[PDB]
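Q: Given only this backbone (86 positions), what sequence would you predict?
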């Protein structure tokens, strides 16, 4: 964990060392992506705990699309947080 910020109504966003941005939504769902990587893929965990990986060519169902769409705004917010430990 390099950075972490709570974003009201949305969730808790964490930037990880490996370049992964993870958002734990307040409904219990989770999405994780690699924004710097053109071939990265997406991991999505349902509230119920079922998790699925989607490779860059894979069709994304609505719930995945919609959560991955939260990421750019979340990256802007992560930029404004200091580093963990600072």
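A: Predicted residues:
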């Amino acid at each position: 964990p390099i950075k972490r910020i709570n974003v009201p109504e949305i969730g808790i966003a964490t930037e990880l060392s490996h370049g992964v941005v993870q958002v734990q939504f307040y409904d219990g769902s989770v999405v994780s992506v690699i924004p710097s990587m053109q071939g990265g893929g997406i991991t999505y965990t349902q509230p119920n705990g079922t998790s699925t990986h989607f490779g860059k060519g894979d069709d994304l169902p609505f719930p995945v699309r919609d959560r991955v769409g939260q990421i750019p705004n979340i990256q802007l917010k992560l930029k404004t947080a200091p580093l963990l430990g600072s």
